[PDB]
Design a protein around this ligand. Structure first.
Ligand SMILES: [Zn+2]
Ligand SMILES: [Zn+2]
Ligand SMILES: [Zn+2]
Ligand SMILES: [Zn+2]
Ligand SMILES: [Zn+2]
Ligand SMILES: [Zn+2]
Lengths: 250, 248, 242, 241, 250, 240
């Protein structure tokens, strides 16, 4: 199938729905989904939803919120208490499944109250909780790949999205560590401070009384001028010891 | 109706002046006003004016005009000798104010001869009256209470994708600006930028150059210490130095 | 003149040719020619040719192919034996001419079989170079590209590997592969612009001067890895990149 | 007030006991006292004692003899065994006291069989006559150089118990792991260095003025300390002290 | 020619003056002069004098004082306010001259009251002083730098200030008025930088500007202290604290 | 094994010798050897010899001719023409051996004339410090014990190790290497090697100083290029 065949299939699917709710993160694929939806159905029939929670930073939320206004869509934020589900709070390998199960549930109730006929995400063809909510991945059921979504992104003149596929803060705690409101706010504030110093790719691992910072090895040399400030700032967030991993990022 | 009305009040004001001259700097709001003026009045009723001066590099002028000339508007450049004003020459804390006074005076002179009804700038939100108010300039995006989000909304909605400091901020308050020392500072910053340091300030302190850099680059800067010391010394500085506080 | 003017001369020239072949490498300048040719003639009347050869890495060849189907073009690869010419294999100062002659000869043979009016390259101001004939400077191609919505292109300039060997050095398959593996390893550490100059038993690493500080955390790993690649001494040029 | 009156204070002090036992360690302070003993009491009346244990290096021990022997002193080595104590092995915050008491206990015995009048240590401002003669850090340095003393341990060899947190019990595998890391790090050219043990994590404390010079050894220390047992190897941003 | 003939001329010169006052700084030269004076004339016929003033640290004074005591000589301190001279207070190029004219004047008054026959400095073969009548016996006996270390070795002299220090006036450009507060703030700045591990350091005073001069090979090791040195010297009175790219001196 | 035994063992051996000739290089070892020989046998019984050759810097030679006279010994300089021998000129893996044989033949010829019983050096020909079982700990101990403060701190190796085996040593390419190392030490790097490789200079530095060296890269590049090198590089393996 050509790029023209699958955009045509994508247009046929959107036209059948008239009114949709789009799960928007700022990503390459969700932006293409949000952009195609507005171009086919219109601004007055597309509702974009961006999720806010403690597991993601508010900087990524505030940014993905405005990327959708830059796309010219009616955007709406919703907040989720992920730690209300213990399966998420206990930080088990399947905690991310229950996060999206709770995420796809909130989208459906919004899809009911706004009058939308389906929930759209930006999942491509190259998972579980995506089906029970009836969420539809239009890009994948039209046989798109990452090479296809990039092609249609240039054709629609889309150049501004996010390259930082942000990760849940739970990856900063070893499996089995109980997440709390305060230790999550402890990690995110330390990562926000380090990012403001000029280090966009950074991890602050949580080791009880120890913070273990992960930087790209080719940036550790540039980090030297900040040792004393990061030490005291992170001590003032609760960490007793502030360290920097010699093994680098991941 | 919020936006729908914020854009409607603007279209009404633009329709009301018929012919306009637009002070253009390349920023978001100057690009937004100029585009709205051409979409409502047409090129033959809109003039974009870009200022050139020694207080800015020979580069940003070539870019701001290149951008409005790319939008398809009759663009005029005008050069102002800001150093003719003693408040600007001796760099007083209100030197910014007397710079706008001089620019808005030149604009109304340009607007009076091409037949425009008003001068427009893209202002949103001290020694006397507002320089805009003193010159009769209209800030239509202010009047419509456009907030930044409203500006952000429309440019994408009208298709605008391409859009963009005075050199006086390199000198202390009270220090006299000369044609030589401005060339001195600007040549110093141009060289440092060519070494791979885009964001840089060379603060002028008579015989001392105080280099401000993002603190996360000072490590990457040490290979150039001796070359930067000798280059700036040949630009007229006796001492070439690096601020430990960094940029800002 | 204005950018919209040089765009029209570029469109008027492309419409007079109707059917063209485009020498595609993946950089900013050849991506703009390919996208402009496609947006004036369509996938039917444009063929993109990407060259595969010993002097350029297979990394750049695979991506350049990938970027060309992504822009919506019918892409054809072709293989060039630069070393089959004795002038190139012995690395004379004339190597650039026979390399260029061999490359452009192959492309006009491709353009003749598909009926193209001319062969296009992306040469700019300061075969037909349409961008240069319309007076496109480096600052102009950045503007027109953002206006069209182009994004993913090879940001680091590609260069023939013959520049890593002294003039008069006979290029073999071993030493070329040796320099390739060295430069490839250095890029993976986080250094996209780098040269490994070949001097028999000595590797001379050329880095941009603003990155040498950031490089010292890698000194030992680079020394060991290039030593296992064949070099006896792994050194860092104090002069820097070029 | 002067260094001369401070030297004459311990000359008279040592010449009143006439037979002593010196807790030799290798530092400049215990090197100063033992030489000051031999000069005023002679080789026959001075006894140099050295404590080998599981909390110290073989290296601070070995050269503590090569020096003690080269001053011309009747050197003799003893071996003490902490960690068999209940308070020291668990690193409770009182372990420093029992380590001291158990140390001072046998010296009291050794000095007995030697017909000595008092035990001496190297404390500054048992018998600490460097503390009684009012010797500060600067007065010990000037008297040591004046007496022609050139050899002493110039990096303070502390007790390995300070590398462990309060509550963690110390093992033959705990200490050897930590002491092997500090030995490896010092071999790279960093003489003042600590390796704090926190189970899976190693916490390196270097002088801040050396951390810039430490970058070139980052990966090698990461791999080596991972082979000694540590899962993570980190550099403390606060530094040494 | 031989060291013994030069020692002989020095011995005879001391025996002829019998009672001497010695300008003692702690260098190898003034140590050799003081040691020889004690050996030939005795303790009660030799007076060592160290100058204490606002233009030097209190610690070089404290060290030179103990050095004279460790050699076994009666040493006394004298205080001079160099800033009472307008040539010194305004820091003129010839301020060095009026500084030592004042230093050599105070010594001669002491040499008058204690019965000395001459004042001795430690000047070898390689202005204000002559006009004061001070005697340089090492110069008169033709001692060169190497002969000083020779005779110092014969006498067992091994301890002395290996670093001759300069007056803080070198931290102020010519024409600057020296005051009791900017003297102290410059000395506190240098005293603090040395505590970080930088023994060779200059803090050049430019009113609102501090121009730190460091050995160029130490600058890399210095980046970790940038922020702490910034705030410390700002609390001392400097608005801008800066690092000279030329390095120590130049 | 006190220090008085070994100081006695040394003067006891010095006593047997009666008259000696000392190979003086300037280091602390040949200094301790020279002063003791002066302290025990006297100035007219000791002849300090300093070798001057193209394989060692003139700065080292001038320093040792002064320090030895500074110590009260009557010095004699001697000039060694190593490059006359073709094993040393062409730098073979055994060219060190012909150098030690040229050196020690010359000083043995000198000791015979002035009437010395032996030639002595400062190893830790007689090595009295080695025979008395000295160590570097005891060499500084006895040095200060006699008032020894001044000696050459950075011990200089033979410049032959800067040239690969097979390279022909010449007057110009030796001056090249020696000028480059003098410059690198004046910047604040006492332990440095500049390996010769025709058009390439391969600087060797301790790995703990490579960061402190960054500020000098450009000035070292152009200085060493004005001395004859086309490419100036830094060895990533560091010193040795
Ligand atoms: Zn003018
Ligand atoms: Zn960097
Ligand atoms: Zn070789
Ligand atoms: Zn360093
Ligand atoms: Zn005063
Ligand atoms: Zn000479």
């Amino acid at each position: 199938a050509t790029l023209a065949t699958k955009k045509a299939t994508l247009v046929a699917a959107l036209k059948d729905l008239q009114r949709v709710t789009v799960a928007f993160s700022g990503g390459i694929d969700s932006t293409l989904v949000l952009k195609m939806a507005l171009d086919v159905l219109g601004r007055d029939n597309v509702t974009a939803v961006v999720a806010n929670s403690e597991l993601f930073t508010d900087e990524e939320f505030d940014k993905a919120m405005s990327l959708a206004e830059e796309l010219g869509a009616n955007v709406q934020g919703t907040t989720l208490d992920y730690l209300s589900d213990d399966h998420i709070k206990n930080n088990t390998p399947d905690s991310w499944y229950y996060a999206k199960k709770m995420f796809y549930s909130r989208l459906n109730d919004i899809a009911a109250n706004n009058g939308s006929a389906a929930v759209l995400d930006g999942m491509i063809k190259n998972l579980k909780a995506r089906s029970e909510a009836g969420a539809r991945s239009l890009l994948q059921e039209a046989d798109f790949f990452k090479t296809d979504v990039r092609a249609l992104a240039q054709e629609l003149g889309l150049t501004n999205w996010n390259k930082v596929a942000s990760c849940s803060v739970s990856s900063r705690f070893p499996y089995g560590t109980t997440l709390t409101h305060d230790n999550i706010a402890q990690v995110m504030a330390a990562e926000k401070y380090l990012r403001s110093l000029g280090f966009p790719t950074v991890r602050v691992r949580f080791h009880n009384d120890i913070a273990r910072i992960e930087l790209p090895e080719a940036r550790i040399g540039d980090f030297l001028v900040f040792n004393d400030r990061v030490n005291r700032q992170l001590q003032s967030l609760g960490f007793r010891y502030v360290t920097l991993d010699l093994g680098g990022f991941r």
